[PDB]
Amino acid sequence: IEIPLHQPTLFSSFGVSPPRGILLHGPPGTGKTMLLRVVANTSNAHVLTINGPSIVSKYLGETEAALRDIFNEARKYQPSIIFIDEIDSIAPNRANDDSGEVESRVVATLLTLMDGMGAAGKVVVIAATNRPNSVDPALRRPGRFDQEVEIGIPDVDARFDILTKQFSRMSSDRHVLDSEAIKYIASKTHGYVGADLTALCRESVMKTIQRGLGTDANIDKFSLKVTLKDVESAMVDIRPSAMREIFLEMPKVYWSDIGG
Amino acid sequence: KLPAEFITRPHPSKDHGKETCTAYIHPNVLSSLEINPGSFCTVGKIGENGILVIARAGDEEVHPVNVITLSTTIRSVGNLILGDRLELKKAQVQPPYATKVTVGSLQGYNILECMEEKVIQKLLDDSGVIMPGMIFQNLKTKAGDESIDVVITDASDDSLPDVSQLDLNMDDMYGGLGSTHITFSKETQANRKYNLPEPLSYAAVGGLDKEIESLKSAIEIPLHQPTLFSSFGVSPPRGILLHGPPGTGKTMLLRVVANTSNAHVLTINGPSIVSKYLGETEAALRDIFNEARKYQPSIIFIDEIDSIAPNRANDDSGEVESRVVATLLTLMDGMGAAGKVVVIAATNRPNSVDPALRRPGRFDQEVEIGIPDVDARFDILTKQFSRMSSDRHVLDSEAIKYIASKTHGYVGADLTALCRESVMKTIQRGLGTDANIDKFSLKVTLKDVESAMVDIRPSAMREIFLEMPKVYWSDIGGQEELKTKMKEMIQLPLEASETFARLGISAPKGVLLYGPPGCSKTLTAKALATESGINFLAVKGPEIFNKYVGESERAIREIFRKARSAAPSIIFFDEIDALSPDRDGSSTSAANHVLTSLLNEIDGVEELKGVVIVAATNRPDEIDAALLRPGRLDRHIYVGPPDVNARLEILKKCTKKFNTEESGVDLHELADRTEGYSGAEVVLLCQEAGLAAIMEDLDVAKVELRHFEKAFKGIARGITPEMLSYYEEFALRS
Amino acid sequence: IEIPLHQPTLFSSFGVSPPRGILLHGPPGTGKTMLLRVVANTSNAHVLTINGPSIVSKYLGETEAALRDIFNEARKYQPSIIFIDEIDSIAPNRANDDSGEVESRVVATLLTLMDGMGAAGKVVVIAATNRPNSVDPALRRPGRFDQEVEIGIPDVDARFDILTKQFSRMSSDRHVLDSEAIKYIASKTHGYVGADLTALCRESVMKTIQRGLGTDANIDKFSLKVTLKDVESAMVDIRPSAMREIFLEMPKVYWSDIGGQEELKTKMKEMIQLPLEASETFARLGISAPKGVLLYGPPGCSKTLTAKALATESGINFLAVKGPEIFNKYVGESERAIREIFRKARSAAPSIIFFDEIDALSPDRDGSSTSAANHVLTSLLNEIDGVEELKGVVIVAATNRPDEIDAALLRPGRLDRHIYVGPPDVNARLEILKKCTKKFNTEESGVDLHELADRTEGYSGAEVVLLCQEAGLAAIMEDLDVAKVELRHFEKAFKGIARGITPEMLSYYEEFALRS
Ligand SMILES: Nc1ncnc2c1ncn2[C@@H]1O[C@H](COP(=O)(O)OP(=O)(O)O)[C@@H](O)[C@H]1O
Ligand SMILES: Nc1ncnc2c1ncn2[C@@H]1O[C@H](COP(=O)(O)OP(=O)(O)O)[C@@H](O)[C@H]1O
């Protein structure tokens, strides 16, 4: 996001032209829009976002006119950011189904608009999809969308870091928990996704609320705070759903445990 | 009236006139814009703010409202091809003045001095002058004829509004028949900081020549010399199909041929013409046809015609379907008698195209655009790098050839993407390492290119035909008998087709290779593709197999027609003992259908004298006796295990990295002990010995004999006399 | 087309009324549009043509009103002719596809309008379709379109005629082509449609233009004109479209080419001479014709090119249909193809239908086969002699393995004749070797063509041809072109090649012949 925008003259000196596409893909809980929000909040450049189905209209030319208008508006302001969410639904695979209406017409017009806005400029288009297979292979071409980044499920290290950052928001004043308990929870959490970790946090907060209520008749929440037991209850009653995975991060084991 | 968009038109009568600010607009349009004609006008071309502010004049009511004339100079500067829609808007405020003004003298060595004779007066005598970009004809200046064009990019004028597309300037002269502090300075090309559109030229396209001259002829014959063809009375063709794998630059070729052609060009946006009521599309297409025919020279482009005109039997969705196909074929068939009109259709796959379109009456001309070869990729790389210039990269010819040799499965778009992400990698390696150092010194190297190819992840690996890597006879270790025989059966066809025709012998066009699966079969196939240098199509056994019934039939038909239409060549099968065995393996009906189709292709009511069919098998008796019929696949080569000489040569080649003198190996005792092994076995033994040597004390300059002998203990022979006797008895019975 | 228009009263006097619908069908590019255009040009009476899909509109009543107005205009002017283009698209099959909207409703209104538009009048309706099968059966009923015109792919004579006519339009000034070149082109172009020939001529002119521009540097195009050099590359790069067809005709091959046994030749000559000049004798006697001859023998020769020899000698159109090519992935497509070929054979005068192989479709019990093969075999059995008996056509079957034909097909009354057609004898092999060595010089080589045949007894005719081919290759690989092939090369090739035929299969064939 920084190379093609912050220094457009340096890249245009080569004349190879900068890429005009960033692809975010992976399973849910990968912080796709979160990344979109982060860059938009951080970068002072103008940002444009689409609502998805709201742009979709029954008329044949209304979508084309809206896309042209938003692209011309982005080109008018030199610092511009383009947001394209649920691109897979917006641009379904041509071979998978010939649904019609919102179909290859909009794909062709959008690729034409993002292929020739100018010589160098500074324009970036970010597309987020749930699955790259369902994405139209015309979209998944090196001519238009050569640059992609892969986002996967967090590992033991990454999952532990996410849990620690989430807890660090409530802070010690809210709860008391050592790093050993956090590491144990991260090791226990294997098939969960990024959103699943926040689901566990909310379920633990719930379980704490009802336990405190039914135990001490609406006592102050600060005394009970957050402990382990409600966390394990949340893991038991959370019904994990992202267990299926192409690759499995089996818990590690050292040579000390090895008998051979 | 209320005209929203206008179509460009070349300025006629040449001469001088005004030549920069003609703008022969209808007086009604002049009054509708609420601006006096004696002022600036603007042309849009669907966007591109600034809108190309150019002064305006009036016509003689002959010029219709739809078309507008704005001179070939501005047409080229704005890269305005014919048929595009131009928007009219109000004029912009007058720019202050011009500062430097500098000529470039393109496609020339400059330093003309005497030949100049005050070109400044001729250049600046014209009104308008959109400072950064003009081109002019050489005209008639003194003696020495020839032609030159100038580049007027260089300037040092600053304009507050950046909305203007090309920030035009004003003029102030002092002379008859002195600028601002001279104008002649250097022969620089178009400046990059202006970000002006680049006019496509044929020098950018590489590796596509052999059919580009045919395309040039097929476009030039009707549009430029139609009287000669009309005198014959066979009527001029109107349609040419371009097809091939994606990423071959079909659209770029169409754009460059449109830019080079000075006649009217018409293009469509693709499927967006599709609308409701089933009448708007018909009205639009008939309007496009009427516009193309109204002006005597015209060219029509059709893009992704497969989506517009899918196969009728394939799908029956409705709406825009075979009805529009019928109306367009009727329009094209009887649009004119002689005329000068050509329609070009671009499709990703010809099979999906409606067979009605693929008819001699409409699209009798077919152009094959395949993946670039080694030579084409070499030229494509040299071409981008030559344009790239050595000021931004340091890589010699051998590095380019080495990269091109490594790149096999890529396509034209893949190379450009690889270069772009190589630039990305170079920028990253500069910034993140040297903390924002000057990028001029580091520039482009080989390591970043190699890493870029490692991380490119190409998506064009699956191909119907594969260009298997070449290898010269020096690296080949084998028996002289098989090499001489193969040289004989490749020398007979190419330089003895006429002898066969005179004598009636023709060619067997069938050679069967059977042997041990250790080595020599594919190695002999390689020598044959490098040595002769003739077209080679590597076809593997399991890869033609498809789960869908009939897809393999289409694949084999396509490869056979490609071989037939791609000059004399050789067809090699890596493993033929997979499709052949059906009675023993109880194969499905698909295998039997494939066998029957290939038999009918090789020796059914047809003869393929140009191409030679060769096959390699591991188990020869499993091939059905129908294939082993006289007249087809008659040649048989034992090509068994390599002899002592071939194994010795292979060992010497593999040991070249190590030092034999320090180790003391005589390169003869090792070969004497290594008799029952194969070439692949010898290579594996050498690799294991090298691994054992390098795991002792890290890097070693030689491999020891003890390591080789330990590898000899640690490996199995892998060959059994029973299968050798099986091969021998198959040879005897044949 | 002349009997309803010029003389309507003569036909109406009978009271049966003249037909109004003429159907033109055939492969694409045959020239149905040419017939439409030429009848439009040569006729001085009013005609009406349709725009096809243009009449089709969103409104259901708009098409009906347009058709009614067209018919009213046609009937108002007493001499009228109706032209229909692509009737299949306008009138698809109800059974195949229920598209809806603009569909067989228009078929019903069209048939209603055209059944009682007039009593005598002078009106004829010409409809051209690409494929007759897709046309709905309502239009394909003798009530409206009983008269049909079949326009198949041009044969060698028709191709020669069109090339002679095609060249005349270009004229001798534009191209120097003689009769021999035209005949050679017609012989080479076997499976080509009429459109393909004109396209080949046009791109031959194109190749001439490129050659002239490349070589002569923009010389006058009339000097180079048209020769056979560009025509060769024309056949090379024409990219034909009529390769897949069931009307493949082998090139004519005379008796001198085939060296075989006189007994088999006499037998097949008698078999072909019985029907053509003894149909009346069969009718008087009631014997009729066996209409079935079985060709079983070793996978050598004399059982496949004998069909070509028969076609050349008799001068009768033959149906050279390969075995495996009738098999199709789609279920029932083979039945459609075989029924179409039977209809064409019946419609194309008394002819002879030859099968390249039958040992693949026939086996259903000995080897595992799909139900489609059994259905096709049952259909063939019902067609050959089941309830329906065909007189003019004669069916001959050639097989490479005899036991694969089931007893249901091998039933008395059909395919009764059996021919051993074994390996060629001494005289046949000697004649084949003499023909093969005709190009070479036997006197210089010193061979008498008799000892070679004496040594070459266990081989076949095709085996002998391959032996001569490889012997010539061995003769020429030494010093390029040679004027003769030596005996040493002959004997070296004799070591190099093997017959590949075992006595066990000959004994099996003899055993099968004994039981028949
Ligand atoms: N020096 C080498 N380096 C890398 N690959 C090689 C080398 N020599 C041969 N090969 C590969 O090994 C293969 C040998 O095939 P081969 O075993 O002869 O086929 P078959 O099993 O049918 O006999 C060839 O396809 C070739 O690509
Ligand atoms: N003397 C000859 N010269 C050239 N070709 C021949 C000669 N004799 C036979 N042939 C060819 O050999 C083929 C023999 O076919 P055959 O192998 O009997 O069919 P199948 O494989 O069904 O048994 C014929 O198609 C014929 O064209």
Residue numbers in the entry:
A (entry chain F): 261 to 520
B (entry chain E): 29 to 205, 220 to 776
C (entry chain D): 261 to 776
Give the article text.
To obtain possible hybrid nucleotide bound states that best mimic the ATPase hydrolysis cycle of Drg1 and to illustrate the inhibition mechanism of benzo-diazaborine, we also incubated Drg1 with a mixture of ADP, AMPPNP, and benzo-diazaborine, as well as with a mixture of ATP and benzo-diazaborine. Taking the dataset of ADP/AMPPNP/benzo-diazaborine as an example, we performed deep 3D classification and analyzed the conformational differences between its planar and helical states. While the NTD and D1 rings are roughly superimposable, the D2 rings display a very large rotation between two states. While the six subunits in the planar or planar-like states are arranged more symmetrically, the subunits in the helical states adopt a spiral configuration to varying extents. Benzo-diazaborine was detected in the six D1 ATPase sites of the planar state, which is more symmetrical, whereas all the ATPase sites in the helical hexamer show no trace of benzo-diazaborine. Therefore, it is apparent that the treatment of Drg1 hexamers with benzo-diazaborine led to the formation of more symmetrical structures, indicating that the chemical also directly modulates the conformation of Drg1 hexamer, in addition to the inhibition of the ATP hydrolysis. The nucleotide binding to the D2 domains was only seen in structures from benzo-diazaborine treated samples, including the ADP/AMPPNP/benzo-diazaborine and ATP/benzo-diazaborine datasets. While the six D2 ATPase sites in the structure of the ATP/benzo-diazaborine dataset are fully occupied by ATP, the six D2 sites in the structures from the ADP/AMPPNP/benzo-diazaborine dataset are not saturated and appear to be partially occupied by ADP. In sharp contrast, in the protomer of planar benzo-diazaborine bound hexamer, the linker is in a loop conformation. Especially, M503 in the loop conformation is released from the hydrophobic interface.
